[PDB]
Amino acid sequence: ENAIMLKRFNRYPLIIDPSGQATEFIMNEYKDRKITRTSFLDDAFRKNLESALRFGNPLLVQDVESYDPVLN
């Protein structure tokens, strides 16, 4: 059901998994699209995020507890 929600979403998903099963699943599903790993704690994250909006590259951001308002 969670994979179904990830496939059919209108608002960008927020994955909450104590383990890394969902994270690794979303990588292995999106390797052909070159999913990029980032985090809100990373200083270069914004730059990476900028690139994600240019070449149509999916982007993963971890540690959403320290949410970046620039993503609004």
């Binding site: 809100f40 914004r46 970046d68 308002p69 620039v70 609004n72």
Partner: protein
């Protein structure tokens, strides 16, 4: 100045922008990020005051509770809303540019520039007449 209290997504920002677009006022949105600091907020306040006081352009200041990070932003805006102008924003070259643009606005409107104090009073009157702030927050 208007404060909009309610749950997020209720349409406060959208309705405010809709009314501002209908009434002709421009909309100014502060673009905040993780690296946002007090000096950036001061520069945004300077820009909006310059566009609202020196020029007769009317501006609807869009702010949300998210855009406020520290108490300095809130205190600067409290001064702006209550007194109509922030005394410490313009310093040095910024003050000189303010006076030059105020003289330009006075001669455009048909007023005599006179001294710095009268020009600043005219700028404050223009700001309180040509600047409106809407603050959106959750209860």
């Amino acid at each position: 100045h208007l404060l909009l209290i309610g749950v997020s997504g209720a349409g406060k920002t959208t309705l405010s922008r809709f009314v501002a677009w209908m009434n002709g006022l421009s909309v100014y949105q502060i673009k905040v990020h993780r690296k946002y600091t007090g000096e950036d907020f001061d520069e945004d306040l300077r820009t909006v005051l310059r566009r609202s006081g020196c020029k007769n352009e009317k501006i609807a200041f869009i702010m949300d509770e998210s855009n406020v990070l520290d108490s300095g932003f809130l205190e600067r805006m409290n001064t702006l809303l209550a007194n109509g102008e922030v005394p410490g924003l313009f310093e040095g070259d910024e003050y000189a540019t303010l006076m030059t643009q105020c003289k330009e606005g006075a001669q455009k409107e048909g007023l005599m520039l006179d001294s710095h104090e009268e020009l600043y009073k005219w700028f404050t009157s223009q700001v309180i007449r040509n600047l409106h702030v809407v603050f959106t927050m959750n209860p």
